[PDB]
Symmetry: C6
Subunit: 30 residues, 6 copies
């Protein structure tokens, strides 16, 4: 089923998203 693996990957992806969105916010809130 790979549930532990899926969840681990989700955490990795969400961490990446949190950074990309930080960069967007930094230019948009300026």
């Amino acid at each position: 089923g790979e549930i532990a693996q899926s969840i681990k990957e989700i955490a990795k992806s969400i961490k990446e998203i949190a950074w990309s969105i930080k960069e967007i916010a930094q230019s948009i809130k300026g």
Copy 2:
């Protein structure tokens, strides 16, 4: 074990995302 850790990290990343998106909305809504 990874599951509890991944979920906690997910919780942290998503809270960071909530704050970045709030900054974007604050500028985009004005």
Copy 3:
């Protein structure tokens, strides 16, 4: 592990995100 707590917090953050994104959409769809 705090899994029940992590998940509770995730729900709180995602709820906040749903509102911020609603405000963005309201100005962007106009």
Copy 4:
């Protein structure tokens, strides 16, 4: 107990997010 409730609320918030983001895309894609 919170877990089933948090997840249901998460499901609801994310569905709301899907609709807001669809509104943004509809304007941003045109």
Copy 5:
């Protein structure tokens, strides 16, 4: 509790979001 159902719906919503965001990215990265 509807946990299996909530999670199934989350997957459906997130799939929709992945597409809307693809359309946004396509116009914004251009």
Copy 6:
């Protein structure tokens, strides 16, 4: 059974979202 499948699909969609948002940030941050 759906839970393992939904979560895997969620993992895939979120990875796609991480890549789309990275493309947006790359343009919005420049």
